[PDB]
Amino acid sequence: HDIAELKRLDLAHHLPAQADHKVIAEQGGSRIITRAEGVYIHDGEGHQILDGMAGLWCVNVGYGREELAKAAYDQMLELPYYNTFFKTATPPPIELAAKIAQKMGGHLSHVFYNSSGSEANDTVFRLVRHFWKLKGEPSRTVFISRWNAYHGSTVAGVSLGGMKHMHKQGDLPIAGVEHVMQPYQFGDGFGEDPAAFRDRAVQAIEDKILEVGPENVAAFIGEPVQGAGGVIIPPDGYWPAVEALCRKYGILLVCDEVICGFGRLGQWFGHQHYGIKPDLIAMAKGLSSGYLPISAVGVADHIVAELREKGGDFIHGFTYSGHPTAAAVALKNIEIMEREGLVERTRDETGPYLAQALASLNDHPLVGEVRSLGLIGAVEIVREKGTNHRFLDKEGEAGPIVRDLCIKNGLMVRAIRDSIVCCPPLIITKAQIDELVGIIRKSLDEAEPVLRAL
Amino acid sequence: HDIAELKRLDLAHHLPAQADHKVIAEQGGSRIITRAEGVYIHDGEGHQILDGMAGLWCVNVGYGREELAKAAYDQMLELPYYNTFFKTATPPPIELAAKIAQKMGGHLSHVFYNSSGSEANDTVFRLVRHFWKLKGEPSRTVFISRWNAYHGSTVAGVSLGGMKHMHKQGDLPIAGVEHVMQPYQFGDGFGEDPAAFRDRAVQAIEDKILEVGPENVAAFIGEPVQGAGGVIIPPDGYWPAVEALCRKYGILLVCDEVICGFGRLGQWFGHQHYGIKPDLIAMAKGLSSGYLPISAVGVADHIVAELREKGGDFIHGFTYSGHPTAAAVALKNIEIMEREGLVERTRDETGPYLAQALASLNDHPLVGEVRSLGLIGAVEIVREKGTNHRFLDKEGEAGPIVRDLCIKNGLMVRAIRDSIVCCPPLIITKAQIDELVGIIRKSLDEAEPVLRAL
């Protein structure tokens, strides 16, 4: 690869996702990632980086899976594409659907296919509203979400998410979406009794239901653990109370499993860790370990019952809904996870090991809190031990400085506000977990003098 | 394949796209498509079908491309995924971006990546509104589209499209979207002077611009040829007049090229046939001939100038934006089109031949009009020669009957209202075009007694 030429062509012709394009121009083009293997990625200048983010929270089986390349090749020779529009389907999405249903359990019996996690929440959005029309309760239209939730980058996904700066671009949210407090103990409930803070966060949802009018509410939606919001792990009992809330008012419960699904929290799906039974789930990312674009909505049997008994078109779906090659890769991806026990390994070994490894950072002068569940975790940067006080009293200054030193030191982790987050491939070894934590500590040590000087 | 078991699993776990699920159950599950080669698909019961729809308006280079499977395999081994979020990129999407820009020409210099045509129009929606905020004209927010337009199946895509029945599901359109008359001469301007009808259809947009307030309008969006709306080919001079209209009021022009792009109308993009210069275009489907999911928005240089000079995050993008494997297949797909001259062949050979072949149906007692451009076409079914009168005076009864006879006779075509439409792979031969037309005539002959009996 002519790296300099790729960088020139990058600026001349490519608009990267969720980027400041002035910043991209000022660095001479995107940093070029050329190769990858295991848990390591390699850039155009030969730098090896431990990918603590598994691509984009998604490469769960790790890089270098010739088995997945082969599954793609074989399906593309036999039948690279056909639609599911013309009362037709193809073998891969049907077999994948049965496999996903087995992993979903509960009353989640069917799947509707898309390509991205964002589209999945568009499908959630339209199917839920159509479901309530079929049920003869057309007033149930309003979705209740949370501030700092992330539910994608479509107009609907942005609206369902609670990122205020993202809302602004496109003049969102669209109508019929309400947002309430997130259960972020460290930031918003520091020093509160966990049980009391949890009750506050659930009560906020009930207050909105009553404000909107329960007969007007269609569903509550939330990530089991908030991902893009900064690995926000809810207090114990939160999710059971939210489930009980939804049943109290007869509204649907929707869990966005796009990050938490497929082994991330030590379960096939995040909601299974919490023992709740959502009516719909959105899934993507780890579904195929990012090897090909595919997404799905898991749909409860009683919603399918309305579609099947009332009939009528559900006028919703995408050209690449059920893409046979993408489905074939996702099926083989799940089989690898099964064969290698990656879900249970995360629950029983790498997860606990990451927790203990991150806990060794607790004594650092910059660290206010570490938290993790399975192979997702977060390190809080504070200017004062024993508080949640942030440098310059302006969240988002310290984070990027520590992040950039991590990347400099050979570790890809993200800074969300002043939180260092990690989400490595499920195949990460204990030694590599120790390497990850060691680089963070090294970077925190280097960050300490610059942060004190702000 | 155990076809019987696949059908059982289909009903138990799969929800097909844009389907009536009661109807799918009543036929014992989806019809199983197992393999394809050239322009032919094969079902679970061994039926070989001439695919007159190229998958879903998309398999432009035809089935059986080992070269495209190989490109996917090779990229997945080297680097199956990395994100464009972290100021990062990978070689394939950058090289693809330069190639797409070369085919777009004009001031369309950059591409923003997504997976589906629907997402691309979400990108159009948010980028257009963000552009106008960067420009210091924040009142420019409203999109003007047309009835019977189709722009995808996300909330925004449904809202931008003009399918009233689709709007209902999800309680759409969202705010800031207006719809005006489509330029459908046969249905809505039968017996009108074409120039006068064209002027009528252009004036409707200006009337809407003036009603909304020109300072409040962000853009007009439209398919060069309306695909899902029934292959609606606009009258001569329509598109130059629409472009002049947009320039008159300083609003952006957006062309949805998801179907019309990549050779379909005899040009790399539909708008190039009409000599207009859109500010943004949406593309998908033929971009990769459906071999892998990928989409893009082509962006004019002056839009990029706002992003690059004002800076700030454009908080928009998807996990699979710039997917390296999908991009590599799309790049090789374009190279196949170049090598085999598919754009020019469509313009100079197969396009004209299809027109000549379809014109032979003009003498059929059921045919009211045939029209085509490149390798997209439509046959109108009427109950009275020389009129646009429809059977039972209820558009959509005759269509499905003829369609089902076509499929029984070995040709996949779709019925949109009482229009039989076709969109075959660009590699279709003249002999196969004659087979396509012959089956349509055979099916019309069989349909005639049943239609007369309604």
Ligand SMILES: *Cc1c(COP(=O)(O)O)cnc(C)c1O
């Ligand atoms: C990644 C993310 C999405 C968006 O998924 P895309 O594939 O990028 O469209 C939606 N929900 C959650 C929880 C996510 O983390």
Ligand SMILES: *Cc1c(COP(=O)(O)O)cnc(C)c1O
């Ligand atoms: C196909 C279609 C879309 C939607 O594309 P998907 O990939 O199915 O989401 C958008 N615009 C036009 C003109 C289309 O024909």
